[PDB]
RNA sequence: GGGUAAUUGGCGCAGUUGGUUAGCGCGCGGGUCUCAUAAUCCCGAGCUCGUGAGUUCGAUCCGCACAUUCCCCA
RNA sequence: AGGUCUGUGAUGCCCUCAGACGCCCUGGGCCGCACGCGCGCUACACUGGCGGGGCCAGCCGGCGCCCGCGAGGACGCGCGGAGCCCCCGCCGUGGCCGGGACCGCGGGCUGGAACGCCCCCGCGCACCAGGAAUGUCUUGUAGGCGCCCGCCCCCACCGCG
């Protein structure tokens, strides 16, 4: 249950892409399909755990669990939530 | 302000900007049944349930 | 940079580490290393003592990692 | 093992052969900090001396410390072979010994002198600092 | 001498008893060379003293440099 | 007017032809090193290193006994397969037991001949994931792991598989 809750709360709901041309970024805000959302949530979980356990004494598994719990709690201490928020803001800025 | 979740009922092709976006028609199953058009990234299919942060934007 | 000992200097073992751990529900070698700033080996030895005594119990075991549960509550 | 608490005689940092040694490391890897002693030669020396090897060097009572010295100046008597030594078939006396700190630096200096006056290929090369073995120069090995 | 105003981060500028404040600018990053974009991090006796207040760039007062106008029997 | 007259009893026209550019012998060199860059290999560690044990391939394929720490060696016959991985322990974020270049004594193999290749003790270099710039890839694929043949007296970080 915790894992599904995390994969839900992690995953963007909006993103920016280049379509407006005009010789510049001209990025346009768009929406995001569910499959991409789950894929990105998983990727972010794994990546955040990986970055912590490197050259640190603690093991990979504890980092994994911590990331999962924090993301499921909706807390922004985690890496996943932070990336989600980042993307959402750079998007809404471009909407 | 509060995001709402819309359903897909028709996909009407990609764009020429590297072919990543796909135009999509959606309907507010919340009760309004408004059939509009948006721009979506990633693989989509009929009966998917998009989530929208705007109740008043368009595309074309 | 940081250094940690490998051998407890006498009263240190009981005046804290034993006390501290006994007030923990779950534990591992590495957590306790990072918590009271001692090397991992000493953690291994101590936890051996404790499972012998009976306060803690094993829930999962393996060469790379084992984790305990506080059976004293 | 099963040594949790520092013994009453724990010695936090050991000095020996002018080098200093810490008492948190296991014994056979601390001695490697001496110049002339490695992993293989140490396990062999201690064992002959009836010393535990999986012990922290701070619990090394001086009684066990002295017998260890007695075995690094006359090791051949104590059963250790001769293919395990640093210096086999010395150029002068033709004997075999093990050379520790201080001895190595002096010994290394005198060979080059021997090489120099004798007028060899290696000696002339050492003094402009080139490769002695046949490993190729030219390619790579540049700033 | 008399009156008026002002001195802030490396930069001019708004801010005045509870943000060290906005832009400029520091370099590392992302964004088809990667800049105009955006993200992030950094830059301080706020000219100098005292006064009361939970708490003054911040309210009064001391003195110095700068600018405008005005005054003059050793 | 891409490369190959240096693969050939494939060749036109030139040059060399008895102090020979023919052929055979002895040595040296093709490897030399202030410097710029092209394909590769090894690592920067805990999703790990060391020690012990258990276990399965394919192109295909050879073994016993006795010495020696080992690499190797003397005899004698026809017979035959691994790394990663899994289990138990040690180390405990320290340029440290990560990494293994350089150098100093010593033991052997090939060969007419070591400058070549293997093993043992000691010493223990750079390196903390890499700027402007750039390459390859869609299922048993990338990547990781090892094993065979070719050239070969000896030798594979190469190449075909």
What does this structure look like?
- The structure is cut from a larger assembly and holds chains A (95 residues), B (60 residues), C (73 residues) and D (143 residues).
- By secondary structure, chain A is mostly helical.
- Helices cover 58% and strands 11% of the residues of chain A.
- Chain A is elongated.
- Chain A starts with a helix and ends with a helix.
- Chain B has one domain (2-60).
- In chain B, strand 2 and strand 3 form a beta hairpin.
- The longest helix of chain C is centred in the middle third of the chain and has 14 residues, at 40-53.
- The interface between A and B is medium-sized, with 17 and 20 residues.
- The structure holds 2 RNA strands.
- The PDB classes it as ribosome.
- The entry lists the keywords Giardia lamblia, Ribosome structure, Translation, parasite, ribosome.
- 40S subunit of the Giardia lamblia 80S ribosome.
- Chain A is SSU ribosomal protein S7P (Fragment).
The whole-angstrom Rg of chain B is 11 Å
What is the rounded Rg of chain A?
Answer: 15 Å
Envelope shape of chain B:
globular
Number of domains of chain B: 1
Helix content of chain B: under 10%
Q: Output the strand order for the largest sheet of chain A.
A: 1-2
Tally of contiguous helical segments of chain A: 4
Topology of this structure?
The structure is cut from a larger assembly and holds chains A (95 residues), B (60 residues), C (73 residues) and D (143 residues).
Chain A: H1 2-9, E1 15-18, E2 27-32, H2 34-53, H3 60-72, H4 79-92
Antiparallel strand pairs in A: 1-2
Helix pairs in contact in A: 1-2, 1-3, 2-3
Chain C: H1 12-22, E1 26-27, H2 29-36, H3 40-53, E2 56-60, E3 67-70
Antiparallel strand pairs in C: 1-3, 2-3
Helix pairs in contact in C: 2-3
Chain D: E1 13-16, E2 19-22, H1 27-30, H2 39-48, H3 62-73, E3 87-88, E4 96-97, H4 103-118, H5 121-126
Chain D binds 2 RNA strands through residues 25-26, 29, 32, 35-41, 54, 81-91, 96, 98-99, 104, 107-108, 111, 126, 130-139, 141-143.
Keywords (chain D): Ribonucleoprotein, Ribosomal protein
Protein name (chain D): Ribosomal protein S18
Pfam families (chain D): Ribosomal_S13 (PF00416)
Provide key terms for this protein.
part of a larger assembly; 4 chains; A: 95 residues; mainly alpha; two-stranded antiparallel ribbon; D: 143 residues; RNA-binding; ribosome; Giardia lamblia; Ribosome structure; Translation; parasite
Question: Short summary of the structure?
Answer:
Chain C has 3 helices and 3 strands; from the N terminus they run αβααββ.
